[PDB]
Amino acid sequence: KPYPCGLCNRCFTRRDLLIRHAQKIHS
Ligand SMILES: [Zn+2]
């Protein structure tokens, strides 16, 4: 899989978790 977040300096596991991370913290 695929999922770097650009708001908090990161790399990742599930998709749904990145969506719930930005859609729960950033916007
Ligand atoms: Zn973040």
Author numbering: 1 to 27
Sentences from the paper on this structure:
To confirm that ADR1a folds inside the exit tunnel, we sought to visualize it in the ribosome at tether length L = Lmax (i.e., at the top of the fFL profile) by cryo-EM. Because, with the relatively weak SecM AP from E. coli, fFL ≈ 1 at L = Lmax, stably stalled ribosome-ADR1a-SecM complexes of this kind cannot be isolated. We therefore introduced the previously described strongly stalling SecM (Ms-Sup1) AP (Ismail et al., 2012) instead. Strikingly, an extra density, not present in empty ribosomes, is clearly visible in the exit tunnel, ∼60 Å from the tRNA. Using this approach, we show that the small zinc-finger domain ADR1a folds cotranslationally as the tether connecting it to the ribosome grows in length from ∼20 to ∼30 residues. Both coarse-grained molecular dynamics simulation and cryo-EM visualization of ribosome-bound ADR1a at a tether length corresponding to the midpoint of the folding transition show ADR1a buried deep in the vestibule of the exit tunnel, providing a clear demonstration that small proteins or protein domains can fold within the ribosome, as predicted by computational studies (O’Brien et al., 2010, 2011). We conclude that ribosomal stalling on the SecM AP is prevented when ADR1a folds and that, as it takes about 30 residues of extended nascent chain to span the ∼100 Å from the P-site to the tunnel exit (Bhushan et al., 2011), ADR1a folds inside the exit tunnel.
Here, using a combination of cotranslational nascent chain force measurements, inter-subunit fluorescence resonance energy transfer studies on single translating ribosomes, molecular dynamics simulations, and cryoelectron microscopy, we show that a small zinc-finger domain protein can fold deep inside the vestibule of the ribosome exit tunnel. To explore the possibility of protein folding inside the exit tunnel, we chose the second of the two zinc-finger domains in the yeast ADR1 protein (Párraga et al., 1988). The domain (called ADR1a) is 29 residues long and folds around a Zn2+ ion using two histidines and two cysteines to chelate the ion. The folding of ADR1a is totally dependent on the presence of Zn2+ (Párraga et al., 1988) and can hence be easily manipulated (Conti et al., 2014).
